[PDB]
Each structure stands twice: as structure tokens, then as C-alpha cells.
Design a protein around this ligand. Structure first.
Ligand code: ADP
Lengths: 19, 44, 141, 97
């Protein structure tokens, strides 16, 4: 569960940096 | 009136040391590879 | 001009375009030299760096200079730990090994293996095909 | 089918044991020569097990080695006895089945 949460946070940050 | 020796068999039970887990680690590796790829895009 | 302006970043964007086009035009040595500049400007600043190491080595292989490719691999493995443990380093090693053995099939296998995990862009495909052709030409010769 | 059309047993190395060969051929592969229809019409089942034994160094392993190639048989599967056993639980029984 920790790794999936980390993946989710990284995907969100990728979105923010793309913006 | 008799003594005896002793001989080993098995490591765990149903599962064996050759393939101990052999899934809980492989799929995780796939998760970690996904993590690495996403980090690649984020840092870029 | 960007390097004179201390704009390392724009200079690198331009030198990437320059090295890529030079390599596609068969000027593999000069492209490798520009990649060496990109590496040096990027050291201590890493993802692009791995790509730079890989591309440098690929140019050297296309120049049929497997020794320079092996030196580039060793350099990258010593100077940047992320290249040391990267797929790009392992791939460059496998390509150097296949070139030294003259096995164009093993090179094609390693290319497919790499492509399954990290898609080869058109540039890498072109350079890898040139390397394969140089192996096959040595086999045919 | 079960025996190669090109074979006469004169070429094969095993010599000095001819009666045993005839007995084996008669009692082992004889039932698998005709078309199947006769056997069920006659109510006879096939043989399943064959046992060879003798003193050390009489030629049995030679027969086993050459029978596969001599009689147009599927490549026989050869396993040494003590190679079946294994460490993990259930591995051996799996290996047999
Ligand atoms: N007709 C024969 N009878 C016995 N041995 C033979 C015969 N022809 C050849 N040999 C030789 O004798 C050996 C056969 O012995 P083998 O059957 O392997 O011993 P074991 O009976 O312990 O398996 C081989 O070296 C083989 O070349």
C-alpha cells in the first residue's frame, strides 16, 4: 500500500510539473 | 533395545525455498519499475 | 552563443539537436565529442546524462570503435552511479559485447529486449541498424 | 507402427541371447501387431510391465540402450533411480507423476 501511495503522489506531481 | 539416526526433509511445507514467495517479489519489481519510469518523467 | 551567456540549459538543448543530427548524418565521431561536452556540462547537475552516455557509446559503435564505447561505459559507470545501475548502461554493455563477438543476431535480441522496457526512438533505431550493418558487413567480408 | 519395416536383429550387437529375445517379442509386442479390432474381439488385455534381472554384467543395459533405436520406438525416457528424490516436500511424488 505504501508503494502504491508513493506512485500516486509521483503521478500527481508529474501532472503539476507538466502544468 | 535399539538407537536411531535422523534425516531432514522439506524447508517450509507446501512452498519451497527454491520458489520461496516467487510472486510477492516479482510483481513488486514490476511496481518498482513503474515507479522508476514515472520518476524519469517527473525529473525530466 | 548560449554557452558564452552561461545558459548551460539552452546550450545543452542546442548541442543535443546538433549531436543528434550529426550522428544521423554519419559524423559519428563529432557527435560523440558533442555528447562528451553535454556530459561534462551535465555532470554534478542525470536522466539526460544516461541518455548522453548511451548515445555517445552508440555513436562510437557506429564508428566501429568498440574500445571507445567500452571506455565511455567505464567512465559513465565510475562517474555517475545512476548510469552504473541503469538499463542504458547494461544495454550499451550488451551492445559492446555483441559487437566484439560479431554476432548481429545477439545485437538484434538485445535491441528487442531493450525496446520492450524502454521504447527505442527513431534516432536509436537508425544508429543501431548502422551498427548491425557494420557487424554483418564484417561477417560478409 | 510398432516395429520398423527395415530390421532383422542380425545387425544389433546383442548376441548369444536369442531365446530370451524371442520370448520377449512374443509376450510383449505381439499383441500390438494386428489391427486393434481383433484384440477386443478376442477379449485379451495388453501387458504393462516387464522385468529383467541377472548377475552383474550380462548385457541387460545394452538391450535397453539399443531397443529404442532398433524397433522404431518413441525415444524412451530414461531415469536413474536415485535421481527421483528431491529436497522440498512433494517434489518427488510430483516428479513421478
Ligand atoms: N551379448 C553380450 N552380453 C554381455 N555383455 C556384452 C554383450 N555384448 C557386448 N557386451 C559388453 O558387456 C557390457 C554389458 O554389460 P551391462 O549389461 O552394461 O552390465 P549390467 O548387466 O551390470 O548392466 C558392455 O560393455 C557391452 O559392450
Amino acid at each position: 500500500s505504501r508503494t502504491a501511495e508513493l506512485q500516486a503522489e509521483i503521478d500527481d506531481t508529474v501532472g503539476i510539473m507538466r502544468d | 533395545g535399539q538407537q536411531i539416526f535422523s534425516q531432514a526433509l522439506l524447508n517450509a511445507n507446501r512452498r519451497g525455498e527454491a520458489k520461496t514467495a516467487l510472486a510477492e517479489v516479482q510483481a513488486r519489481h514490476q511496481e518498482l519499475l513503474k515507479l522508476e519510469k514515472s520518476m524519469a518523467e517527473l525529473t525530466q | 552563443w548560449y554557452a558564452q551567456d552561461q545558459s548551460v540549459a539552452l546550450s545543452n538543448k542546442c548541442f543535443i539537436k546538433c549531436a543528434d543530427l550529426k550522428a544521423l548524418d554519419g559524423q559519428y565521431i563529432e557527435a560523440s565529442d558533442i555528447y562528451s561536452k553535454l556530459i561534462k556540462s551535465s555532470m554534478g547537475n542525470q536522466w539526460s546524462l544516461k541518455d548522453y552516455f548511451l548515445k555517445k557509446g552508440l555513436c562510437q559503435l557506429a564508428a566501429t570503435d568498440a574500445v571507445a564505447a567500452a571506455r565511455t561505459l567505464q567512465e559513465g559507470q565510475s562517474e555517475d552511479p545512476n548510469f552504473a545501475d541503469s538499463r542504458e548502461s547494461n544495454f550499451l554493455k550488451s551492445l559492446i559485447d555483441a559487437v566484439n563477438e560479431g554476432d548481429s543476431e545477439q545485437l538484434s535480441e538485445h535491441c528487442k529486449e531493450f525496446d520492450n522496457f524502454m521504447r527505442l526512438d527513431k534516432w536509436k533505431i537508425t544508429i543501431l541498424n548502422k551498427i548491425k550493418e557494420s557487424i554483418q558487413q564484417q561477417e560478409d567480408d | 507402427a510398432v516395429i520398423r519395416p527395415d530390421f532383422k536383429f542380425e545387425d544389433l550387437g546383442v548376441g548369444g541371447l536369442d531365446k530370451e529375445f524371442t520370448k520377449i517379442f512374443r509376450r510383449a509386442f505381439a499383441s500390438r501387431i494386428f489391427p486393434p479390432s481383433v484384440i477386443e474381439k478376442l477379449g485379451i488385455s495388453h501387458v504393462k510391465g516387464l522385468l529383467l534381472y541377472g548377475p552383474p554384467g550380462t548385457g541387460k543395459t545394452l538391450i535397453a540402450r539399443k531397443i529404442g533405436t532398433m524397433l522404431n520406438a518413441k525415444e524412451p525416457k530414461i531415469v536413474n533411480g536415485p535421481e527421483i528424490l528431491s529436497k522440498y516436500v512433494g517434489s518427488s511424488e510430483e516428479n513421478i507423476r
